[PDB]
C-alpha cells in the first residue's frame, strides 16, 4: 500500500499534505497519545508513573479519548508499507515519535523519523528523501527531564503541604526561576536612591546659533554634585566664565542590524516592541510555523541556510538596491534561526492568521531581511567646550546612509549641532541645574526573565515558556503591568528551599543539569545513571528536610507566640 505519515496536529497535517504526493497518507495524532499519569512507596510510584527505586521503570498510559485514535492509527499502519514519524525536531518531538512507534507496534525497520525546520515543498522533499532513524539518546534525554521534574514535583510538594501550606507546588527549574524574582524583589525593597545633579548650559555661537551643552568636568574631574548647595556653587562660577570651543571631533560611525531571531530574542523583541507576553508570542509563532510561514520556533541557533541567504539577498537587491547589499553574506553565531519560510510572502498576505500573528510575522520578517543588509552610516560630532575650570560637552549625529534601518518603520531624529571651530567664543544664555536620583534595579518582564534564565544557562528554548507559565499560577510570583512581583508565599517557599535544598536551588548546579541532559542526548552520558546521581543527592536533601527543625529539618511556616 501507500506510506503513513504521522504528525502532532491538524494544522501541520493540512500544510504538509500540500507537499506530499498521493502515495502518502497524512494523519495527525492530535496531541500526545501516551504520557505519564495526569526506601519506597507504591502509592507514590503509582501517582508519579515512574519508579526511582526500580531502575526508573515507567508506566505510560493512553490519554483520555485517545483510545479511538490508536485504533485508527493501527488500521492505517497495517495498510501502510512504511511509517514516517514527522513530529517536530526537538527532544519532545522525538519522544512523541517514540510513543507513537511504541504504541503502533511492529518492527522498528518499519519506521523512519523525518526532520525539517519548516514546512515547505523543498524542506519536505529533502526531509523524506533521506529519512533518518529515531534517536534513542534524544528520547532518553527528554524522559530524563520529565522524570526529574516528576520526582521534585511529587516528592517535594507533600513536604511543603505539611511544613508550609496545602496545595503548594514545587518545580525543579520553576523554583529556581522564582528565586530570581524573589532576589530582585528584595533588591528593590532595599534600594535607597542616591542624589546627584547635572548642569546644562544654553549658549550662542559666533553666528548666533543655539548650542546646548552639559557640564562634564571641573578642575579636570568628573562633575557630579550630590546636592543643591554644591550645584549652586558651580552655577555661580559658570555664570561668570568665558566659554570657548576646546576641540571638535567629527568621526564616521555606524549601526549594525541584529542577528536573526532565536526563541529568547524573539520573545524579548515581541514584548518590547509589540507588547506581547511570552505565552502569546509562542502560541502565535506555533501557528505561523504549522501554517508553513516560518521556521521552527524553538531554537537557539542564529544560523541561516545558504538558500535562505540567497533568497533574502535577492529580495534586498530587487527591492532596495546594491547599496544595501553587503559584499558577502553576514554569518551570525544543523539548526536555524527563526525566519520567514518565503521572503516574498508579506505579513499582509498571510491566510487564516489573526492581526497580532501577522504583526509577529512582520517582526520576524523585518529582522531577517535587516540582518543581511548593510550597516547604517552616520557622521558623529563631539564638541568640547572650556569655561574657566569647567569642561562641557555636546554630541550630535547626522544620518548619511540608512542601510538596514530602511526596512524598519520610518523615523518620527534630533541633533545636528551648529557649525563651530576651535577657539570660537560662545555666549552664555542660560544655565539649567537639574536634580536626579539613581533608580532601583528594573523589574523582570516575562521575556526579560527568560533573558536572565538564558544568560545563566538555566532554561532551554523548549522550556522558557513553560517555566514562565508555571511559576505564575502557583501564588509565588505575579505579573502586574507586564512586570513580575514576588508574592509573600514565593519568598516563604524560596527561603525554605534554599535552606533545605541548597543544591537544587543553586544556579550553577541547575545550569549543569541542563548540560548533563545535553550529554545524554549526545551519547556522552547514560540517562538512568544521570537520574540515579540526581535522585541520590535529592533524597539526601529530602530526608534531612522532613526532620524536625531542631535537627536541621525544614522550618514550619508559623510564628510561635507566648
Curated annotation (Swiss-Prot):
<keyword id="KW-0238">DNA-binding</keyword>
<feature type="site" description="Interaction with DNA">
    <location>
        <position position="154"/>
    </location>
</feature>
<feature type="site" description="Interaction with DNA">
    <location>
        <position position="146"/>
    </location>
</feature>
<keyword id="KW-0479">Metal-binding</keyword>
<feature type="site" description="Interaction with DNA">
    <location>
        <position position="161"/>
    </location>
</feature>
<feature type="site" description="Interaction with DNA">
    <location>
        <position position="149"/>
    </location>
</feature>
<dbReference type="GO" id="GO:0008270">
    <property type="term" value="F:zinc ion binding"/>
</dbReference>
<keyword id="KW-0799">Topoisomerase</keyword>
<feature type="domain" description="Topo IA-type catalytic">
    <location>
        <begin position="135"/>
        <end position="542"/>
    </location>
</feature>
<feature type="site" description="Interaction with DNA">
    <location>
        <position position="474"/>
    </location>
</feature>
<feature type="active site" description="O-(5'-phospho-DNA)-tyrosine intermediate">
    <location>
        <position position="296"/>
    </location>
</feature>
<feature type="site" description="Interaction with DNA">
    <location>
        <position position="32"/>
    </location>
</feature>
<comment type="function">
    <text>Releases the supercoiling and torsional tension of DNA, which is introduced during the DNA replication and transcription, by transiently cleaving and rejoining one strand of the DNA duplex. Introduces a single-strand break via transesterification at a target site in duplex DNA. The scissile phosphodiester is attacked by the catalytic tyrosine of the enzyme, resulting in the formation of a DNA-(5'-phosphotyrosyl)-enzyme intermediate and the expulsion of a 3'-OH DNA strand. The free DNA strand then undergoes passage around the unbroken strand, thus removing DNA supercoils.</text>
</comment>
<keyword id="KW-0413">Isomerase</keyword>
<dbReference type="GO" id="GO:0003677">
    <property type="term" value="F:DNA binding"/>
</dbReference>
<comment type="similarity">
    <text>Belongs to the type IA topoisomerase family.</text>
</comment>
<dbReference type="GO" id="GO:0006265">
    <property type="term" value="P:DNA topological change"/>
</dbReference>
<keyword id="KW-0863">Zinc-finger</keyword>
<feature type="binding site">
    <location>
        <position position="88"/>
    </location>
    <ligand>
        <name>Mg(2+)</name>
    </ligand>
</feature>
<dbReference type="GO" id="GO:0140226">
    <property type="term" value="F:RNA topoisomerase activity"/>
</dbReference>
<feature type="binding site">
    <location>
        <position position="8"/>
    </location>
    <ligand>
        <name>Mg(2+)</name>
    </ligand>
</feature>
<protein>
    <recommendedName>
        <fullName>DNA topoisomerase 1</fullName>
        <ecNumber>5.6.2.1</ecNumber>
    </recommendedName>
</protein>
<keyword id="KW-0862">Zinc</keyword>
<dbReference type="GO" id="GO:0003917">
    <property type="term" value="F:DNA topoisomerase type I (single strand cut, ATP-independent) activity"/>
</dbReference>
<feature type="site" description="Interaction with DNA">
    <location>
        <position position="145"/>
    </location>
</feature>
<feature type="domain" description="Toprim">
    <location>
        <begin position="2"/>
        <end position="119"/>
    </location>
</feature>
<dbReference type="GO" id="GO:0005694">
    <property type="term" value="C:chromosome"/>
</dbReference>
<keyword id="KW-0677">Repeat</keyword>
<dbReference type="GO" id="GO:0005829">
    <property type="term" value="C:cytosol"/>
</dbReference>
<feature type="region of interest" description="Interaction with DNA">
    <location>
        <begin position="169"/>
        <end position="174"/>
    </location>
</feature>
<feature type="site" description="Interaction with DNA">
    <location>
        <position position="298"/>
    </location>
</feature>
<keyword id="KW-0460">Magnesium</keyword>
<comment type="subunit">
    <text>Monomer.</text>
</comment>
<dbReference type="GO" id="GO:0003916">
    <property type="term" value="F:DNA topoisomerase activity"/>
</dbReference>
